[PDB]
Coordinates of C-alpha atoms in Angstrom, one line a residue:
Chain A
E1 CA -2.5 13.2 7.0
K2 CA 0.7 13.0 4.9
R3 CA 1.7 10.4 2.4
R4 CA 5.1 9.4 1.2
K5 CA 5.4 7.9 -2.3
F6 CA 7.4 4.7 -2.3
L7 CA 8.8 2.4 -5.0
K8 CA -25.3 17.4 23.3
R9 CA -21.6 16.6 23.6
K10 CA -19.6 17.5 20.5
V11 CA -16.7 15.5 22.0
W12 CA -16.5 12.0 23.5
Chain B
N1 CA 22.0 4.9 -4.2
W2 CA 23.7 8.2 -4.8
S3 CA 25.2 10.4 -2.1
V4 CA 23.8 13.8 -1.4
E5 CA 27.1 15.2 -2.6
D6 CA 26.8 13.6 -6.0
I7 CA 23.2 14.6 -6.3
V8 CA 24.2 18.2 -5.6
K9 CA 27.1 18.0 -8.1
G10 CA 24.7 16.8 -10.8
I11 CA 22.0 19.3 -10.1
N12 CA 24.5 22.2 -10.1
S13 CA 25.8 21.2 -13.5
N14 CA 24.7 23.1 -16.5
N15 CA 23.5 19.9 -18.2
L16 CA 19.8 19.3 -18.2
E17 CA 20.3 15.5 -18.6
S18 CA 22.8 15.4 -15.7
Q19 CA 20.4 17.4 -13.7
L20 CA 17.6 15.0 -14.5
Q21 CA 19.7 12.0 -13.5
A22 CA 20.7 13.6 -10.2
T23 CA 17.0 14.6 -9.6
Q24 CA 15.9 11.0 -10.2
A25 CA 18.7 9.8 -7.8
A26 CA 17.3 12.2 -5.2
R27 CA 13.8 10.9 -5.8
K28 CA 14.9 7.3 -5.3
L29 CA 16.8 8.3 -2.1
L30 CA 13.7 10.1 -0.7
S31 CA 11.5 7.1 -1.7
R32 CA 13.5 4.5 0.3
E33 CA 11.6 2.7 3.0
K34 CA 14.0 3.5 5.9
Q35 CA 14.8 7.0 7.1
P36 CA 14.8 9.2 4.0
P37 CA 17.5 11.9 4.3
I38 CA 15.0 14.7 4.0
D39 CA 16.9 17.1 6.3
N40 CA 20.2 16.4 4.4
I41 CA 18.5 17.2 1.0
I42 CA 17.1 20.4 2.5
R43 CA 20.4 21.5 4.0
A44 CA 22.0 21.0 0.6
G45 CA 19.7 23.8 -0.8
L46 CA 18.1 21.5 -3.3
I47 CA 14.4 22.6 -2.9
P48 CA 14.7 25.8 -5.0
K49 CA 16.3 23.7 -7.8
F50 CA 13.4 21.2 -7.7
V51 CA 10.9 24.0 -7.7
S52 CA 12.6 25.5 -10.8
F53 CA 12.5 22.1 -12.5
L54 CA 8.8 21.9 -11.9
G55 CA 8.4 24.6 -14.5
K56 CA 10.5 22.9 -17.3
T57 CA 7.6 22.2 -19.7
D58 CA 10.3 21.3 -22.2
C59 CA 11.5 18.4 -20.0
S60 CA 8.5 16.5 -18.6
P61 CA 10.7 13.8 -16.9
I62 CA 12.5 16.3 -14.7
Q63 CA 9.1 17.8 -13.9
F64 CA 7.9 14.4 -12.7
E65 CA 11.1 13.6 -10.8
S66 CA 11.2 16.9 -9.0
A67 CA 7.5 16.7 -8.2
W68 CA 8.0 13.3 -6.7
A69 CA 11.0 14.4 -4.7
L70 CA 9.2 17.5 -3.4
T71 CA 6.2 15.4 -2.6
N72 CA 8.3 13.1 -0.4
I73 CA 10.0 16.1 1.3
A74 CA 6.6 17.6 2.0
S75 CA 5.4 14.3 3.5
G76 CA 7.6 14.8 6.6
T77 CA 7.6 17.2 9.5
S78 CA 5.9 20.6 9.5
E79 CA 9.3 22.2 9.2
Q80 CA 10.1 20.1 6.0
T81 CA 6.7 20.9 4.5
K82 CA 7.3 24.5 5.3
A83 CA 10.7 24.3 3.5
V84 CA 8.9 23.0 0.5
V85 CA 6.3 25.8 0.7
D86 CA 8.9 28.5 1.2
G87 CA 10.6 27.5 -2.1
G88 CA 7.5 28.6 -4.0
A89 CA 6.2 25.1 -4.7
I90 CA 2.5 25.8 -4.3
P91 CA 1.9 27.8 -7.5
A92 CA 4.2 25.5 -9.5
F93 CA 2.3 22.4 -8.4
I94 CA -1.0 24.2 -9.2
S95 CA 0.3 25.0 -12.7
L96 CA 1.3 21.4 -13.1
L97 CA -2.3 20.3 -12.2
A98 CA -3.2 21.1 -15.8
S99 CA -0.3 19.2 -17.3
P100 CA -1.1 16.9 -20.3
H101 CA 0.8 14.1 -18.6
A102 CA -1.5 12.3 -16.2
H103 CA 1.3 11.1 -13.9
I104 CA 2.7 14.6 -13.5
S105 CA -0.7 16.1 -12.6
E106 CA -1.3 13.2 -10.2
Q107 CA 2.1 13.9 -8.5
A108 CA 1.1 17.6 -8.2
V109 CA -2.2 16.5 -6.6
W110 CA -0.3 14.3 -4.1
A111 CA 2.1 17.2 -3.3
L112 CA -0.7 19.7 -2.7
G113 CA -2.4 17.0 -0.5
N114 CA 0.7 16.8 1.7
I115 CA 1.0 20.5 1.9
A116 CA -2.6 21.1 2.8
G117 CA -2.5 18.2 5.3
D118 CA 0.2 20.0 7.2
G119 CA -2.4 22.2 8.8
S120 CA -5.1 24.9 8.5
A121 CA -2.6 27.6 7.6
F122 CA -1.1 25.8 4.6
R123 CA -4.6 24.4 3.6
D124 CA -5.9 28.0 3.4
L125 CA -2.7 29.1 1.5
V126 CA -3.2 26.3 -1.0
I127 CA -6.8 27.4 -1.4
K128 CA -5.8 31.1 -1.8
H129 CA -3.4 30.1 -4.7
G130 CA -6.4 28.7 -6.6
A131 CA -6.1 24.9 -6.4
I132 CA -9.7 24.0 -5.9
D133 CA -10.8 24.9 -9.4
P134 CA -8.1 22.9 -11.3
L135 CA -8.5 20.0 -8.8
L136 CA -12.2 19.8 -9.4
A137 CA -11.8 20.3 -13.2
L138 CA -9.7 17.1 -13.1
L139 CA -12.9 15.3 -11.8
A140 CA -15.3 16.8 -14.2
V141 CA -16.1 13.7 -16.1
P142 CA -19.4 12.0 -16.9
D143 CA -18.3 8.7 -15.2
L144 CA -15.6 8.6 -12.5
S145 CA -15.0 5.0 -13.5
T146 CA -13.1 6.2 -16.6
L147 CA -10.4 7.7 -14.5
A148 CA -7.4 5.7 -13.3
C149 CA -8.0 4.2 -9.9
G150 CA -4.8 5.6 -8.2
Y151 CA -5.4 9.0 -9.8
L152 CA -9.0 9.1 -8.4
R153 CA -7.8 7.9 -5.0
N154 CA -5.2 10.6 -4.8
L155 CA -7.6 13.3 -5.9
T156 CA -10.1 12.2 -3.3
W157 CA -7.5 12.2 -0.5
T158 CA -6.2 15.7 -1.4
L159 CA -9.7 17.0 -1.5
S160 CA -10.3 15.5 1.9
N161 CA -7.2 17.2 3.2
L162 CA -8.7 20.5 1.9
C163 CA -11.8 19.8 4.0
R164 CA -9.7 18.9 7.1
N165 CA -8.7 20.7 10.3
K166 CA -10.3 23.4 12.4
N167 CA -9.2 26.7 14.2
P168 CA -10.2 27.8 11.6
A169 CA -12.4 25.5 9.6
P170 CA -12.0 25.7 5.8
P171 CA -13.4 28.7 4.1
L172 CA -17.2 28.4 3.6
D173 CA -17.1 29.3 -0.1
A174 CA -14.4 26.6 -0.6
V175 CA -16.6 24.0 1.2
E176 CA -19.5 25.0 -0.9
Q177 CA -17.4 24.6 -4.1
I178 CA -16.1 21.2 -3.1
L179 CA -19.2 19.5 -1.6
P180 CA -21.0 18.5 -4.8
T181 CA -17.9 16.6 -6.1
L182 CA -17.7 15.1 -2.6
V183 CA -21.2 13.8 -2.9
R184 CA -20.3 12.4 -6.4
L185 CA -17.3 10.6 -4.9
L186 CA -19.3 9.4 -1.9
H187 CA -21.4 7.5 -4.5
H188 CA -18.4 5.9 -6.1
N189 CA -17.7 2.1 -5.8
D190 CA -14.0 2.1 -4.9
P191 CA -13.5 1.3 -1.1
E192 CA -10.6 3.7 -0.7
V193 CA -12.4 6.6 -2.5
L194 CA -15.4 5.9 -0.3
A195 CA -13.3 5.9 2.9
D196 CA -11.6 9.2 2.1
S197 CA -14.9 10.8 1.0
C198 CA -16.4 9.7 4.4
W199 CA -13.4 11.2 6.2
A200 CA -13.8 14.5 4.3
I201 CA -17.5 14.6 5.3
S202 CA -16.6 13.8 8.9
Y203 CA -14.2 16.7 8.9
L204 CA -16.9 19.0 7.4
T205 CA -19.5 17.9 10.0
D206 CA -17.1 18.5 12.9
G207 CA -18.0 22.0 14.0
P208 CA -20.9 24.3 14.6
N209 CA -24.4 23.3 13.5
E210 CA -24.2 25.6 10.5
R211 CA -21.5 23.4 8.9
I212 CA -23.4 20.3 9.7
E213 CA -26.3 22.0 7.9
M214 CA -24.2 22.7 4.8
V215 CA -23.5 19.0 4.6
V216 CA -26.9 17.7 5.4
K217 CA -28.6 19.9 2.8
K218 CA -26.8 18.0 0.1
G219 CA -28.8 14.9 1.0
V220 CA -25.8 12.7 1.9
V221 CA -27.2 11.2 5.1
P222 CA -28.8 8.1 3.5
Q223 CA -25.6 7.3 1.7
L224 CA -23.7 7.8 5.0
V225 CA -26.0 5.3 6.6
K226 CA -25.6 2.8 3.8
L227 CA -21.9 3.1 4.2
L228 CA -22.3 2.7 7.9
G229 CA -23.7 -0.7 7.1
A230 CA -20.6 -1.6 5.1
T231 CA -18.2 -4.5 5.8
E232 CA -14.9 -2.6 5.4
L233 CA -13.9 -1.1 8.7
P234 CA -12.0 1.7 6.9
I235 CA -15.4 2.8 5.6
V236 CA -17.5 2.2 8.7
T237 CA -15.2 4.2 10.9
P238 CA -15.4 7.5 9.0
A239 CA -19.1 7.0 8.2
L240 CA -19.8 6.4 12.0
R241 CA -17.7 9.5 12.8
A242 CA -19.7 11.6 10.4
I243 CA -23.0 10.3 11.7
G244 CA -22.0 11.0 15.3
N245 CA -20.9 14.6 14.3
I246 CA -24.2 15.1 12.6
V247 CA -26.3 13.9 15.6
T248 CA -24.3 16.4 17.8
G249 CA -26.3 19.1 16.0
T250 CA -30.0 20.1 16.2
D251 CA -33.0 17.8 16.7
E252 CA -33.8 18.2 13.0
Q253 CA -30.4 17.0 11.8
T254 CA -30.5 14.1 14.3
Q255 CA -34.0 13.3 12.9
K256 CA -32.5 13.3 9.4
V257 CA -30.1 10.7 10.7
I258 CA -32.9 8.6 12.3
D259 CA -35.1 8.7 9.3
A260 CA -32.3 7.3 7.1
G261 CA -32.5 4.1 9.2
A262 CA -29.3 4.5 11.1
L263 CA -30.5 2.9 14.3
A264 CA -31.1 -0.4 12.6
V265 CA -27.3 -0.7 12.3
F266 CA -26.4 -0.1 15.9
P267 CA -27.0 -3.6 17.2
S268 CA -23.8 -4.5 15.4
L269 CA -22.0 -1.3 16.1
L270 CA -22.7 -1.5 19.8
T271 CA -21.3 -5.1 19.8
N272 CA -18.5 -4.4 17.3
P273 CA -15.2 -6.2 18.3
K274 CA -13.3 -3.0 17.5
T275 CA -13.3 -0.9 20.7
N276 CA -13.1 2.4 18.9
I277 CA -16.2 1.5 16.9
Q278 CA -18.1 0.6 20.1
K279 CA -17.0 3.8 21.8
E280 CA -18.0 6.0 18.8
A281 CA -21.4 4.2 18.5
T282 CA -22.1 4.6 22.2
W283 CA -21.2 8.3 21.9
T284 CA -23.6 8.7 19.0
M285 CA -26.3 6.9 21.0
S286 CA -25.7 9.2 23.9
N287 CA -26.2 12.2 21.7
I288 CA -29.3 10.7 20.2
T289 CA -30.8 10.1 23.7
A290 CA -30.2 13.8 24.4
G291 CA -32.8 14.6 21.8
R292 CA -36.5 14.8 21.7
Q293 CA -38.8 12.3 23.4
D294 CA -40.0 10.8 20.1
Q295 CA -36.3 10.2 19.2
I296 CA -35.7 8.4 22.5
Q297 CA -38.9 6.4 21.7
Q298 CA -37.4 5.5 18.3
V299 CA -34.3 4.4 20.2
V300 CA -36.5 2.2 22.3
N301 CA -38.5 0.7 19.4
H302 CA -35.3 -0.4 17.7
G303 CA -34.5 -2.5 20.8
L304 CA -31.3 -0.5 21.5
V305 CA -31.8 -0.1 25.3
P306 CA -30.8 -3.7 26.0
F307 CA -27.6 -3.0 24.0
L308 CA -26.9 0.0 26.1
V309 CA -27.4 -2.1 29.2
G310 CA -24.9 -4.6 27.7
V311 CA -22.3 -2.0 26.9
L312 CA -22.7 -0.6 30.4
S313 CA -22.3 -4.1 31.9
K314 CA -19.2 -5.1 29.9
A315 CA -17.0 -3.0 27.6
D316 CA -13.9 -0.8 27.5
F317 CA -14.1 1.8 30.4
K318 CA -14.4 4.7 27.9
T319 CA -17.3 3.0 26.2
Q320 CA -18.8 2.5 29.6
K321 CA -18.4 6.2 30.2
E322 CA -20.2 7.0 26.9
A323 CA -23.0 4.6 27.9
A324 CA -23.4 6.3 31.3
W325 CA -23.7 9.6 29.5
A326 CA -26.3 8.1 27.2
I327 CA -28.3 6.8 30.2
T328 CA -28.1 10.2 32.0
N329 CA -29.3 12.0 28.8
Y330 CA -32.1 9.4 28.4
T331 CA -33.3 9.8 32.0
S332 CA -33.1 13.6 31.8
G333 CA -35.1 13.9 28.6
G334 CA -37.2 10.8 28.7
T335 CA -40.8 10.3 29.9
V336 CA -41.6 8.4 33.0
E337 CA -42.7 5.4 30.8
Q338 CA -39.4 5.3 29.0
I339 CA -37.4 5.6 32.3
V340 CA -39.5 2.7 33.7
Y341 CA -38.8 0.7 30.6
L342 CA -35.1 1.4 31.1
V343 CA -35.3 0.2 34.6
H344 CA -37.1 -3.0 33.5
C345 CA -34.2 -3.7 31.0
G346 CA -31.7 -4.1 33.9
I347 CA -29.9 -0.7 34.1
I348 CA -29.7 -0.5 37.9
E349 CA -27.2 -3.2 38.6
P350 CA -24.6 -2.2 35.9
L351 CA -25.0 1.5 36.7
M352 CA -24.4 0.8 40.4
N353 CA -21.5 -1.5 39.7
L354 CA -19.9 1.3 37.7
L355 CA -19.9 3.5 40.8
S356 CA -16.7 1.7 42.0
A357 CA -14.6 3.3 39.2
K358 CA -11.7 5.7 40.0
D359 CA -13.2 8.4 37.8
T360 CA -15.1 11.4 39.1
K361 CA -17.0 12.4 36.0
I362 CA -18.7 9.0 35.4
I363 CA -19.6 9.0 39.1
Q364 CA -21.3 12.4 38.8
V365 CA -23.1 11.2 35.6
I366 CA -24.3 8.0 37.2
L367 CA -25.5 9.9 40.3
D368 CA -27.4 12.3 38.0
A369 CA -29.0 9.4 36.2
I370 CA -29.9 7.8 39.6
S371 CA -31.6 11.0 40.7
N372 CA -33.6 11.2 37.4
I373 CA -34.8 7.6 37.8
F374 CA -35.7 8.3 41.4
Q375 CA -37.7 11.4 40.3
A376 CA -39.6 9.2 37.9
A377 CA -40.3 6.6 40.6
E378 CA -41.5 9.5 42.9
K379 CA -43.8 10.5 40.1
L380 CA -45.1 6.9 40.1
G381 CA -44.8 6.3 43.8
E382 CA -42.4 3.4 43.4
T383 CA -39.4 5.1 45.0
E384 CA -39.5 2.4 47.7
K385 CA -39.2 -0.4 45.2
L386 CA -36.4 1.3 43.3
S387 CA -34.5 1.8 46.6
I388 CA -35.0 -1.9 47.3
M389 CA -33.4 -2.7 43.9
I390 CA -30.5 -0.4 44.5
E391 CA -29.9 -2.0 47.9
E392 CA -30.1 -5.6 46.6
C393 CA -27.4 -5.2 44.0
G394 CA -25.1 -3.7 46.7
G395 CA -25.5 -0.2 45.4
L396 CA -26.6 1.5 48.6
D397 CA -23.2 0.6 50.0
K398 CA -21.6 2.2 47.0
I399 CA -23.5 5.5 47.5
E400 CA -22.7 5.3 51.2
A401 CA -19.0 5.1 50.3
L402 CA -19.4 8.0 47.8
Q403 CA -20.5 10.0 50.8
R404 CA -16.8 10.2 51.8
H405 CA -15.6 11.2 48.3
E406 CA -13.0 13.9 47.7
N407 CA -15.3 15.8 45.4
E408 CA -17.9 18.2 46.7
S409 CA -20.6 17.5 44.1
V410 CA -20.1 13.7 44.5
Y411 CA -20.4 13.7 48.3
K412 CA -23.3 16.2 48.2
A413 CA -25.3 14.2 45.6
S414 CA -24.7 10.9 47.3
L415 CA -25.9 12.4 50.6
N416 CA -29.0 13.8 48.9
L417 CA -29.8 10.5 47.4
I418 CA -29.4 8.5 50.7
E419 CA -31.4 11.1 52.7
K420 CA -34.2 11.7 50.2
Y421 CA -34.9 8.0 49.4
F422 CA -32.8 5.6 51.6

């Protein structure tokens, strides 16, 4: 993820 | 609302105050809600100037403004984050982590979080520059509740990004260094901190069983189950992801999950109105039914087989695929008594109705499950009755149609079923 500042089966 | 030209004019002046005002204008431009002109700022060659400003200990405001601007630039595409990294921003931000101004250190934390969140390469580069030690030093307090809420949230999110991504997974020594603080944060009260800690744990448990073991050794599974029983979806989602990842491992790790009481939460999860929650919970159940026979028995005791029958009868098609997988694992590893119980709960009709789907994989899974149930009946001598059941719900016609399928395995298995039992 990035944020701007404002203001058995291992896989399914 | 300055223009990029005016910003450049001010930043290129030999006046620290004019530079500060131009940098603040750039920050405000990059902080607007609609289409920040990141590419225009980069083309103007402003990143090196911001990076140089990061080191102006004599002027903390310009440090803060340039850190904010660079944070917002690094929040965009991989090319823009790369532009930030190429300016030498990583070591400058790491040096700012120890700033006496809390807002500046927090901004550096945010920027490093964006950089690491770009991908595994930049994550490992941030780690090589020595960020983990100062980051964790920021959290070395007797009570996390004394820290500012936003500061703690940003620290947790950045740490989670350092635990994120694979190919390759984070360095083992870095994971070992971070995990204790992650446990601490996982016992915090703030919902956002809890969500981000659960996401970090989900990242760390996504991989080979050795990583799952590193996590499970810390004793976090009971807390993960407690959070699984939370009301906030942003907490349940990562908690459920982590639990599923863990149960993809060895029988001992799955048993650690079961002993913490996770199954008691699955009546709600398997009926959750959020389709993704239902799918993830059914996938977790499918991996649990692939375990030992006592673990299948524990699934039975918690009354979860009727919930699997329900999910198989009505749910999103992907959830139904996960449920078919769970049934096939159950019937492959389960005893004859457990398979008979499964039949008594009403699995035949939904499993046969699902054979009309335009998906080959679920068809093969369902045929394997049917073969397993038929083997159990053979062991009991009730094959005739089971064939009667499959015929009454219209399933014999479905297998007869599967005879003429475009897949070798499907046609072959349908033929074997109809000739060996029907």
